[PDB]
Amino acid sequence: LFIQPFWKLRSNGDNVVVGDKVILNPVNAGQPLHASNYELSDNAGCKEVNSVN
Amino acid sequence: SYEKIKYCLVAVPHGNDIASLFELDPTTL
């Protein structure tokens, strides 16, 4: 996974700081992780994490 | 308008008032 800056403050080559916000892009998928709104039937109140724009 | 914001920025001729003092905080360590 590539860790990329969600904020314009940080650029490539900078050091990540705890408490910030980042984007996780898989090397092969090339699509950032997304917390969809599709509730799982098996467990109530649980969404799904999928790799998509 | 108090919109969600309470105060708005504006230009003031005089500069000896205490309403023109601003502190700068860093974004990194």
Binding site: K8 | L9, V10, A11
Partner: protein, 54 residues
């Protein structure tokens, strides 16, 4: 004449480094999120401060 030129101090030699935000320096306040420059301009008889779009 007999005038005396009192020499006040404004900045030291050590603080004149160009790698520092020095007092009296002139800069522009760029906005990273909106990618716009802060500006103040005369609009309708009263000066207003805003973020210009380009």
């Amino acid at each position: 004449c007999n005038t005396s030129w009192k020499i006040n101090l404004f900045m030291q030699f050590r603080d004149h480094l160009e790698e520092v935000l020095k007092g009296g320096d002139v800069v522009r306040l760029f906005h990273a999120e909106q990618e716009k420059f802060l500006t103040c301009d005369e609009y309708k008889g009263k000066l207003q401060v805003f973020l210009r779009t380009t």
